[PDB]
Design a binder for this molecule. Structure first.
Ligand SMILES: OC[C@H]1O[C@@H](O[C@H]2[C@H](O)[C@@H](O)[C@H](O)O[C@@H]2CO)[C@H](O)[C@@H](O)[C@@H]1O
Ligand SMILES: [Ca+2]
Ligand code: NA
Ligand code: NA
Ligand code: NA
Ligand code: NA
Length: 425
């Protein structure tokens, strides 16, 4: 009934529209061009590239790295669902991985943010036309961040697995960085949003030990080296994960641990999933969305859908998990009578909260008037999953409602993999 493949193809285009830096010649987004070409570290290190996080122009390293790891995971384990779109998806995520390698300026220094979130948000306009100072902040032993660094290692290690067959030299570059960055994370303990306090209003980290587990598991998967499993076993998930997201890795670790034969983790994964199924502990809206929170409700559901599909591949609650994942993705695509995916389906959102998509065609000026205009965005941000409805299915397609209507890297990450998973059924 729904064209899941069309949505997956559009999701890849969303990531293309989030690119910072010197865009590739094959750039498919005609309203995006080169931008942030002076992004640099405090020693002059090149920090160009990466993805803008949301409807803004900050490069936030924790969600950017989680997005990459999560996207990569689906390309590894749901490869058949990706099908003829896998190579496109793989090329897309290189944008993030290459940036992470640039951020890793020396063994024990990792850039974790470029842009001041408050200053960035005070601008409305095209990223190509920014003129404000864009500070860069790094993690070091005296300013640690085991969470951001652990996630960055996870993404690189997952990348090494994905790219091993097609591009061994690239895989070996990724793994070398992943090892060194994980050592940094493990040997220098702290919350990155304490070390980079600008991030504490945007991507406040609740804990880092879940990233230490997650990163170790991915390095175990990438290397086969028992010491990484021993490290993962120091940080095993405790209790039921609240959700899977850029902040909490536990549900993801539960799937990986289950895949490696951890019996406790398999039971914990069952307990997580059953809560999200109908008649569990997660609120259901009347129209069938498994609703976790006010902000990014569709993201949280899609992230659980992705975990459910992966868990089903491990034989965990298999049919019910697949039924759940389909119900949630169908809510996103159209089951309520409208789409929540920009540029897709029936009555999609027209005014997602996104600076560049809000701007008219070049060469017209773009500024704060574009933020509040009741007209549709002039550019269509194809593929973006919006924040989504409240607990009673109410949703406003209002550009200024950045709870209902923002879009973000992390929002699309679980979603894109879930689409691949459904395409294998
Ligand atoms: O929990 C947030 C907020 O909810 C308010 O109720 C909302 C309900 O969440 C929403 O889905 C429905 O469409 O509108 C109502 C009324 O705004 C609630 O009244 C607040 O007390 C609460 O903080
Ligand atoms: Ca965490
Ligand atoms: Na504290
Ligand atoms: Na817990
Ligand atoms: Na219940
Ligand atoms: Na079942």
């Amino acid at each position: 009934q729904y064209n899941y493949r069309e949505v997956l193809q559009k999701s890849i285009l969303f990531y293309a529209a989030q690119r910072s830096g010197q865009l590739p010649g094959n750039n498919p987004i005609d309203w995006r061009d080169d931008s942030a070409l002076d992004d640099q570290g405090n020693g002059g290190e090149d920090l160009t590239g990466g993805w803008y996080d949301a409807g803004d122009h900050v490069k936030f390293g924790l969600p950017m790295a989680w997005t990459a790891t999560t996207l990569i995971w689906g390309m590894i384990d749901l490869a058949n669902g990706y099908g003829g779109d896998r190579n496109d998806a793989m090329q897309s995520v290189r944008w993030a991985l290459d940036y992470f390698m640039k951020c890793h300026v020396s063994d024990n220094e990792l850039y974790g943010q470029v842009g001041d979130g408050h200053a960035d948000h005070a601008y409305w306009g095209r990223p190509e036309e920014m003129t404000m100072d864009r500070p860069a902040w790094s993690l070091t032993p005296s300013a640690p961040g085991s969470d951001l660094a652990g996630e960055t290692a996870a993404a690189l290690a997952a990348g090494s697995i994905l790219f091993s067959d097609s591009d061994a030299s690239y895989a070996n570059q990724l793994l070398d960085h992943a090892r060194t960055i994980y050592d940094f994370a493990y040997n220098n303990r702290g919350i990155y949003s304490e070390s980079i306090p600008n991030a504490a209003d945007f991507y406040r980290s609740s804990a880092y030990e879940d990233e230490l587990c997650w990163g170790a598991l991915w390095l175990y998967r990438a290397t086969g080296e028992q010491d990484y499993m021993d490290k993962a076993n120091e940080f095993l998930p405790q209790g039921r994960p609240w959700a899977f997201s850029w902040d909490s890795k536990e549900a993801g670790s539960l799937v990986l641990l289950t895949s490696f034969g951890n019996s406790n983790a398999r039971a914990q994964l069952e307990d997580f999933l059953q809560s999200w199924f109908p008649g569990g502990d997660i609120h259901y809206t009347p129209l069938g969305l498994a609703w976790r929170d006010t902000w990014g409700s569709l993201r949280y559901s899609a992230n659980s859908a992705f975990i459910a599909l992966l868990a089903a591949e491990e034989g965990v609650l298999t049919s019910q998990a697949r039924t759940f994942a389909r119900a949630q993705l169908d809510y996103m695509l159209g089951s309520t009578g409208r789409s929540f995916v920009v540029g897709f389906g029936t009555n999609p959102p027209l005014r997602p909260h996104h600076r560049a998509a809000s701007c008219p065609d070049m060469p017209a000026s773009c500024g704060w008037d574009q933020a509040s205009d009741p007209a549709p965005n002039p550019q269509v941000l194809d593929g973006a999953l919006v924040g989504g409805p409240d607990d009673q299915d109410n949703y406003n397609d209002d550009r200024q409602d950045y709870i209902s209507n923002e879009v973000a890297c992390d929002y699309n990450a679980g979603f894109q993999g879930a689409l691949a998973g459904i395409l294998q059924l």
